[PDB]
Design a protein around this ligand. Structure first.
Ligand SMILES: CC(=O)N[C@@H]1[C@@H](O[C@@H]2O[C@H](CO)[C@H](O)[C@H](O)[C@H]2O)[C@H](O[C@@H]2O[C@@H](C)[C@@H](O)[C@@H](O)[C@@H]2O)[C@@H](CO)O[C@@H]1O
Ligand SMILES: CC(=O)N[C@@H]1[C@@H](O[C@@H]2O[C@H](CO)[C@H](O)[C@H](O)[C@H]2O)[C@H](O[C@@H]2O[C@@H](C)[C@@H](O)[C@@H](O)[C@@H]2O)[C@@H](CO)O[C@@H]1O
Lengths: 308, 308
């Protein structure tokens, strides 16, 4: 008597990255035994429980909201954060950081915009947040932005950060940042992160994670623009609504080609919200534009996949 | 033998505007008899046929892709457009303009970003497109951007526009632009638009359109930041996948409050993809955060709604 489980029939290129507000481009698999894979956005169980800092909006990912204060002698501003819905932020909520907070170390550039309530005057400036920096303390309710102005922003007026892309210091090794698999210190460098969505890894020999991959825009230097999420944002929204019970640890999915009527490959969708495939090595999957995932049956962690 | 029709159970504040990449904030109704309501984004039939310039990605709305050429003596660049998927753009496709093109007259500000293929060097600059301007000819394959640079962008390298918000000329009447209900001239001022999604209006006495409303960020001046769409982007994605046949002209929806178990109001979801309610005058709806739409039955255009 369990509600039947399903995944969306949207194709990969019809879906959105859950870790940055950009479209998916491709599927990628590679080894990740050497390091911890623990993203906090795009985390959701198959029965619809949001984890980490995951929230439902594709466009709220890596945004910030609040009001700002200027740092004299600079073009830097401190943002005192509001909640996702512009109310008072509560640091004691059982989350790692405000929902939608970036979950990787990098220099994220976008625009800081503001409206003055009284007359509806507005202003917007290019701005960058360094999520690896000492003032990056979103869990404690504040982050710092570098901007292109020393005086234009007003205090105590609603201010929004909209992300666009990432930058790198071109005097250093190319593509050495961002580091998408390094979590920020949400409460600052001397404080451990809390309430995290768990790290994920394949346990089965010869299996690797299957990533939903995008390329982040670059705004300066030579950044590493690869960005891999565990679930498309549309899958997060789907499971959240459906809330179908997980009848076992693992949902077997087949990736189907409607142009031939044949299955390209099969994969495991684990109930805690990630996908694995039977393959060894780094590989950009080549898929038909009309290809889609289809849930076929509940299996478990001991199931042997056909090689990808 | 028709597949059962449904709408998503996401709440309003859990969904995304289909005309700009920002969250929904509220429901709004007002009279629109005096003017033509003909948006081209967020247009989809209840049985899943995309119309106008509508595409499936919430983050692709009001983006542009292509390569750029500098205009000497200025900080202006012409973008020769690529398709939504970075291929050659075909001006003869039966659409008004490239998918995701802005469907209103306004000055849209964001970032123009670029990557050089050979070495992975990147650059990003603040940029504005005036969709009412003479060089705004997206259907013909080109638009113009004003930027903060006269020399940094390279030719013949992939270039992306990411929208953030809107601006207004502060020397003129406040909130006189953008004009969200004025379509751009997609082929320029002397050429009529083609392949448009149709204009919509209530036909029933005492009914008005029900709008899904957001506030666009403002980046300069005193802009009109109201933005009303006919369908949430998540509804577009839902109908596209479900493709449930419309058994009549009108789906009756009830907006339900789970905190009391009572219906707040009922409304008509027309098969061509828009909502009406029984109300006269401008009104910001006040709704419970957990409120949701529920499809109850197929009726038709002659059905009399309970007053909102
Ligand atoms: C030394 C330094 O950090 N300079 C950056 C500048 O980057 C340098 O730009 C050069 C050409 O303009 C070379 O490409 C150098 O390798 C590079 O380090 C940076 O310019 C941004 O990124 C570079 C790589 C180019 O893509 C530029 O087009 C782009 O604007 C600017 C912009 O923030 O800042 C310093 O001047
Ligand atoms: C005359 C003109 O168009 N000036 C804009 C400037 O706007 C003026 O800014 C004043 C205060 O700086 C007053 O607010 C004027 O009413 C306004 O016309 C504009 O500044 C942007 O928008 C204004 C309304 C303020 O919100 C500013 O904070 C904001 O930067 C700037 C920025 O593009 O351009 C011209 O200088």
């Amino acid at each position: 008597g369990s509600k039947p489980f399903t995944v969306p029939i949207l194709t990969v290129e019809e879906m959105t990255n859950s870790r940055f507000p950009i479209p998916l481009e491709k599927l990628f698999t590679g080894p990740s035994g050497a390091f911890v894979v623990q993203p906090q956005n795009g985390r959701c169980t198959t029965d619809g429980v949001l984890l980490g800092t995951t929230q439902l909006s594709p466009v709220n990912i890596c945004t910030f909201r609040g009001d700002v204060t200027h740092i004299a002698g600079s073009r830097n501003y401190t943002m005192n954060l509001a909640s996702l819905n512009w109310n008072n932020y509560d640091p004691t909520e059982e989350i790692p950081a405000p929902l939608g907070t970036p979950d990787f170390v990098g220099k994220i550039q976008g625009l800081l915009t503001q409206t003055t309530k009284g007359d509806g005057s507005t202003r917007g400036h290019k701005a960058t947040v360094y999520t690896g920096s000492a003032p990056f303390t979103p869990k404690l309710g504040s982050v710092q932005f570098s901007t292109d102005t020393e005086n234009d922003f007003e205090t105590h007026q609603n201010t929004k950060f909209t992300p666009v892309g990432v930058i790198q210091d071109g005097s250093t090794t190319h593509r050495n940042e961002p580091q998408q698999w390094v979590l920020p210190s949400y409460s600052g460098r001397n404080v451990h992160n809390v309430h995290l969505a768990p790290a994920v890894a394949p346990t089965f020999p010869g299996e690797q994670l299957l990533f939903f991959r995008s390329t982040m825009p670059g705004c300066s230097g030579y950044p590493n623009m690869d960005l891999d999420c565990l679930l498309p944002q549309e899958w997060v929204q789907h499971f959240y609504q459906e809330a179908a019970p997980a009848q076992s640890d693992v949902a077997l999915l087949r990736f189907v080609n409607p142009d031939t009527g044949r299955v390209l490959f099969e994969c495991k969708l684990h109930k805690s919200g990630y996908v694995t495939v039977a393959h060894t090595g780094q590989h950009d999957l080549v898929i038909p534009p009309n290809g889609y995932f289809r849930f076929d049956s509940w299996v478990n962690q001991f199931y042997t996949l056909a090689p990808m």
